Symmetry: D2
Subunit: 504 residues, 4 copies
């Protein structure tokens, strides 16, 4: 008989696992337990800090919540108004020397006139074709061009998406974008071109909140802390090494065995198939595709340059830089980098030069966070990528050659994006029902591998809904119907439900 027995075991304490745990904790029915190999919960929603005191998330993390329940747990965890900062959702596309407001097509007035002509002509073709279309697009590429036309597609979404996904747009499905018809808003686009108008999709209503301290990672430490500590096992002692699906037994690295009746696994599903020693599942998970993410962080001396201003995140379709996205992380919280009086030496100038002096000087400081994707179709030279990113910062006029870099950061995350390939659904609908037959609920960004429900709130709710299905017979809506949950505000499920009110 096992060392420990619980009704429901949760593997992994990123957002998905912590969602499952919060719901089990609230229900307070079946016994339960959560394990993670890391001492610190959060998964890919964690945060690092450099020796010089610059924080970096695992790339740009901006919360948009589709669920009251998710909101309830964040409010519980970080309940003070000064636990958070609010910002507008300000983003731009870098294109031919210009910062073009997102969405790109509504702002092509900034481009040269001859190019505007090409863009409008292409979108006219797409509008005329959309008017008689009687089939759905089958690939991401087809969807892009039917929405945007050839010209606008070639400038942004085609080269941008290869830089992000590390696979061509022709090899991805397009159902994950939702059920919106692939057609141009020709009038809107042409109107701004005629008016010479620019317009971003943000304002006092289009906002996000970001944690005052600890980066995105601070949220999940705070949420985890609301759980009964004896029901958690985090660290080397919590690393899962073996899953015996037939005996419903799990073995940890230190040899501890855990028996379960139901399993919620939030580890990557290809790792799960190995831990199970299931040759059939290993073969199937190997049919899936993912990209790795390099996160590069750069700490810069000086007050925030006028050219940067209130920018939050930025897209880079062009090939003069390796990164697809940059984040002005110092704009998210004053505590993402040291205060102005902190003294740091200059490590190098942006052009690669040595500084005049080695003396530690004061701030203030700002901070840029970069993302570079990697796959077997898009290799990344690990040894030069930092320097390539810094050159890319100069090329894109984010840094001057003279800017003083005081901190650098580079980390590679093996599983970064689960790719919406054409083959994905054919594979997942074999994998997930086989796990289900064994009472294994494999869920999460890489637990169930669906990018369109792959953010923090989706993940958290995948765990919540998994538990609700296990206990109360709930439909796993986020898992099976992304369009459904993304197109509504999910208000019904709360951190305090009728059941707990009636109980007291």
């Amino acid at each position: 008989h096992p060392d420990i027995s619980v009704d429901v075991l949760v593997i992994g304490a990123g957002p998905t696992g912590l969602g499952a745990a919060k719901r089990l904790n609230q229900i307070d029915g079946p016994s339960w337990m959560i394990v993670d190999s890391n001492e610190t919960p959060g998964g890919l929603a964690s945060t690092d800090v450099t020796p010089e005191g610059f924080l970096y998330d695992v790339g740009g993390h901006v919360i948009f919540s589709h669920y009251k329940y998710f909101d309830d747990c964040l409010d519980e965890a970080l309940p003070k108004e000064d636990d958070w900062y609010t910002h507008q959702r300000i983003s731009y596309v870098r294109c031919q020397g210009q910062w073009v407001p997102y969405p790109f097509q509504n702002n092509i007035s900034m481009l040269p006139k001859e190019e505007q002509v090409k863009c409008i002509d292409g979108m006219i073709d797409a509008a005329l074709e959309a008017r008689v279309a009687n089939t759905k697009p089958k690939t991401f590429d087809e969807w892009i061009v039917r929405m945007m036309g050839t010209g606008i597609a070639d400038l942004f979404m085609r080269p941008y998406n290869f830089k992000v996904w590390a696979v061509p747009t022709t090899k991805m499905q397009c159902a994950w974008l939702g059920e919106r018809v692939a057609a141009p808003n020709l009038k809107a686009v042409t109107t701004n071109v005629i008016l010479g108008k620019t317009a971003g999709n943000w304002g006092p209503a289009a906002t996000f909140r970001f944690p005052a301290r600890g980066g995105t990672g601070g949220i999940w430490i705070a949420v985890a802390n609301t759980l009964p500590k004896e029901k958690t096992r985090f660290g080397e002692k919590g690393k899962v090494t073996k899953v015996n699906a037939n005996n419903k037994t799990v073995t940890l690295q230190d040899g501890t065995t855990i028996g379960y009746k139901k399993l919620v696994s939030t580890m990557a599903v290809d790792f799960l198939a190995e831990a199970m020693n299931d040759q059939e599942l290993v073969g199937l998970t190997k049919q899936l595709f993912y990209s790795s993410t390099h996160v590069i962080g750069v700490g810069v001396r000086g007050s925030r340059p006028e050219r940067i201003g209130d920018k939050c995140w930025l897209y880079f379709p062009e090939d003069n830089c390796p990164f697809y996205r940059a984040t002005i992380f110092s704009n998210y919280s004053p505590y993402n980098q040291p205060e102005a009086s902190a003294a740091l030496p200059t490590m190098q100038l942006a052009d690669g030069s040595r500084p005049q002096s080695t003396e530690a000087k004061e701030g203030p400081y700002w901070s840029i966070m970069l993302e570079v994707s990697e796959s077997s179709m898009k290799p990344v030279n690990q040894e030069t990528i930092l320097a390539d990113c810094i050159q890319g910062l100069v090329n894109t006029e984010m840094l001057k050659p003279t800017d003083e870099i005081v901190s650098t950061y580079h980390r590679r995350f093996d599983h970064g994006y689960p790719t919406p390939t054409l083959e994905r659904e054919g594979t997942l609908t074999q994998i997930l029902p086989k796990l289900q037959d064994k009472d294994i609920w494999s869920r999460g960004r890489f637990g169930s591998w669906r990018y369109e429900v792959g953010n923090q709130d989706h993940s958290f709710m995948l765990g919540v809904e998994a538990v609700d299905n296990i206990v109360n017979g709930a439909v796993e809506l986020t898992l099976n119907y992304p369009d459904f949950v993304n197109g509504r505000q999910n208000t019904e499920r709360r951190l305090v439900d009728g059941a707990q009110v009636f109980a007291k």
Copy 2:
């Protein structure tokens, strides 16, 4: 303090209310109680019997379940195999002296050739227009025309639907439609006309099960029997007369008061507004529309005639009869009518005349159940409707003039169909949230007034999900997303869920 206090009060013990009850009973958390003014649970899913021993449902009731939870509760209530009879879903449309397999719009093949031309020409126009359409249809009529063309619309869809809904197709919305009206492929319809093929949509997979005894009403009597009796109050002692929403207090006819934390109300929402003495809610509910259903039953002497055969239900678009639908109710169970040795005198011949003898004679017997709709746009002469129906049976050749009728039944059900009018949703999105703000879950066929989720399984689950929302913060999917629940197999929620498994150890 009131006579009784419960966390959750359920008003009504038709399928919706019973569903609430069953889920509350399964959860076994909050205290609850269920009331009904009728001693026998079942609502519009009840069954009547004539003095001569012929059973009649409230019109044609055929079960198609979208939910394993519903299946579970029926199986629990009627667990034996001989509790049920299984049949194929055989229906036809009476059209110009002939029985056309349902769906009509696919058996074009069976009409006079000249009419086939008319139909196919119309459908060709519709196919070409559909090729360039970029707007959705706004009315039931526009929808019908767009998917079938004028010829088929006129021959069947338009007249039949006025006969059922008792309002013209131009007066109804079309969002409710996915699962009720078949949209014909031009190539499929044309292929069947060329091949001279008649192809109805039934067979070994498309079946239904019907209770062996007690009619459809037998289900809900048995389901109710699985509830703890003390938590029920059925009869005059359970008739709700006043609802004080602000004090969260209900008053019954005998004067009993019941306090509640949450209310699940399954009575017609216009009745609820009146019981609340809420003039604003009364005015809103009056913007809703419903039709009444007349149910007529006819018991016939004789073994089942060949011309009837295995027919289950039948549609009547034409003018030679007042009913829109007939059910061969004696095909559903042998216990829906007397055994063959039962002796019964003839009451009349089908042609209206007196029988040659008034002596009681033996069977066998078969049985027809007819439905006639009524509204302010379609008045019905209540005094002659029985005789009109019987003449309609002679007219459609279902009865011979000389057939011997041994039993008759007629009952009017005031609230029969909640009409999907153009105005329905604008009104409901005022009514339901205003009740919601008062912790009142108004749910069911007339509780929430949505016909597209108005069958027995829909109703039952409206009750279940209401409770699940109240207790576990579940999404009321059936209520707000008919297309979602009707388009899938709903397997997740069971009569035994993990909660009960884990608790019992």
Copy 3:
């Protein structure tokens, strides 16, 4: 027996009749003669002069020739290079204080940003509707909206066309406009908006030639002069009063009778019906519609103003002036107005005041020619129309308040435009074949009433082709197929054909 007998009698010596006479004269087979009530041939293609020496055509007359035959005859009649001046076809549309290059609908790029949006949005709508359109437009208005969208329709097409046709766009057909109304290309128009460019000249017409002396009327005086004088009868002596179609006899006002075998009538067909004393025909011609043309002439002291420059004709859709078109007639020939040394007193200033003195001062002089339409749907105040035009010239900034006016001219031409009404073709197909069966070829701008073949070259060729049909069995292509003759270069028929070349041997 009548006073005169010819094989072919030609009535009218405008372009159409002169066309007939020239071809008859070239063929030199059948006997013929041509009559006109006017001593000076030319009809609506004539020219007046004011006592102060300013010439005015009957409104803006610019020649574009579709036929080599027409070229040959103009060349014969006015053979010297200094008989002609050549000009670029420079026109603009007055809109919101701006001059928009013709055609308006292709130069959206010139309007304010706000108006550009309204225009392009409209054109996008039209482009998308046109992608799935399977019916041709019935009316001029439907055509305008289908091809240009509501924005350009409201801003220019609808007001301008009522102002010139003197009927709403909804009352006209749209089969006539292939060569008159440009259909805008969405990509092309949008591309020029983005680049802020003007559009390439619509049509093959880049320049035009205009006669050095006598205005447009000089051409027809000279063409007529090439005819044998004995075969003409112009003046009171040549006015037709009676046409006896059954006797094939024509009576002139002086009592002269002319018997004919074939008749080419170029007078207005409604007048012809009257002269025929044919009540049925009069009835039919009254189903036709026409507008009247007021021509207003204004002679101005001064060297040609910079704001005027090389402008030729100008369009005015706006309601701040009565005229639909202005022509800088002084740009067409130096001899359309007096020498600079000619001394003329100021008659009035453009603001309407009397001048300081009666002193005759020298020039130079320039000249504006205006057109105002009239019909039963659009009355014109004859007594004030001159002053209204002059104020119009001030509102449109064509004249400064202080500009000195040295000559004025006003003349009303009752039949100005044959209106392409919805009813036109139905009526003409009852009229023209009836006349045909009586050996009457009724042809010309009002002879056959078809504006799309109603220019000088068209008219001339209607007379030529009518004679060719009569003598050589030719197809009357211009009469029956406007799109055919307007869409090709008609090079085959010449002033010297093979017949004449061989015969001279």
Copy 4:
């Protein structure tokens, strides 16, 4: 100075040349003469006779006239009523053991049901595509499929047209087919299928007349005979061997030289280029494409079989026979074959066996005329083609194995069809203008190489209009605008025009 001088020389006395000659003769102006290498006029519109007395045209020749002038000349040539026979235009398609009335698609109810399904499914696809089409088809093959859909295309027009043109449908243009939109009449086709109806496109109105004697060739003998004999030169004495364009001189085989001012050439334009010894033109003409025609005649003993009946011509898409078209030539005139009392021996039975006797036996007789095409893409074994044709008659059940054949006929015509290749116009617009610059009017079926104006009436009028262009400056409509002349009733040009009427006074 040449042996003979004329103003206009016409080469060739087939229909085109005779048209030119008839119009020259009528105009009676410029001097002219017509030459031909054959003593008998008619060209490809001539008629042969076998030693047994069976006549054969050059394949099926049926007159549909688009011109009054053509009717005038035919009626002048053969003015008596008994010079002609009148018949309805009765034709069928041989398909899967059936004679299917033309047009094929309106008669597919004769096909097996499963095949009707595939045909109608294809045409539904075609109609749905046509509804949103925004481009014209570019090839004959695209035109066929857009009009018929795949299934119907594969059964008739695709395999049939390869058998006719001896080139694939994918290699031909489709503009020659005219301006009608390539689109299905889906309602018409489905209606006849639903009704089980067959219907040909003939009846009392849709008739042709055929000469009573001498076949089609009789027409042109009679027309030629109205010409003044001394202006003709037919036979070896009239064969042109050299054309010197730069000197406007023609040389005949007997050494006679003719000087002309204008040349109308109706010989094949590739021969003309060789005769001109113009290397550039020879290169260009070699870019053109044409098929050769084999004509096979079979004379059969017996009264007309019931299975043949009133059939006139027949299409053969299938590959169980080499011919694309058959004509029941004995149905055109009783004088196309010997009278019944004429005695002929049997040459063979249709299955190839010897007759039991070689005695002459009497008739009556009927007659079949067949056409086989030949090109480099589709060779013909001249040695076996007769035997293959006769086997084809058995395969198609036109002849029984036992039918007695009393006469056979085979002749190959090198220039048979001028092919409407994709490249044709690109080449012709280089050839015809260069010849035009030399005062050479190259006109006719192979004179101008355009099949869509390649019938007898078209050809005759090409000559007429060429002369009219030379003399009177007429537009050459038939040459340059096939759609125009084929879509109208051409009634203006007559054998007696005004010119002749007036001159005779």
